[PDB]
């Protein structure tokens with residue numbers, strides 16, 4: 498996929514806005530939130546066949562998801578939520594939906610001026626994270 502290629506790279510977190518409140522709305526407790534706030538992840542996005550693969554490396558733990566665009570799959574998040582998830586293209590954007598325990602959250606990945614911007618929404622709580630190619 499052409500639009501996915503813009504995301505395919507090794508990325509490092511450079512800025513985060515309101516992620517603590519976002520985690521709080523998800524139900525993450527204070528201490529685990531501290532882990533989420535201090536960790537600096539390395540995020541590798543790639544295309545392998547018809548699958549998109551997102552590998553995240555950090556001291557806390559490493560995660561890996563592999564999916565076909567628009568196909569629902571089971572996802573265990575870094576905070577151990579067991580979700581039904583789907584990642585789809587919306588124009589040039591990647592939209593990731595996570596459903597668990599009757600709840601729903603979504604986040605959007607965009608390439609803007611060569612950087613990756615992730616906007617996360619749960620209810621009316623919004624967080625924004627910036628990443629740059631490593």
Ligand SMILES: O=C(O)[C@H]1[C@H](c2ccccc2)[C@H](C(=O)Oc2cccc3ccccc23)[C@H]1c1ccccc1
Pocket residue numbers: 510520523525529530532533534536538540553554555557558559560575576604617
């Ligand atoms: O930035 C990313 O893409 C990923 C980071 C990461 C992953 C694995 C290990 C450590 C960090 C974010 C993140 O902080 O995860 C959480 C870590 C700890 C607790 C968390 C609680 C709730 C939610 C995330 C947590 C990962 C990420 C992926 C997709 C959307 C937002 C954040």
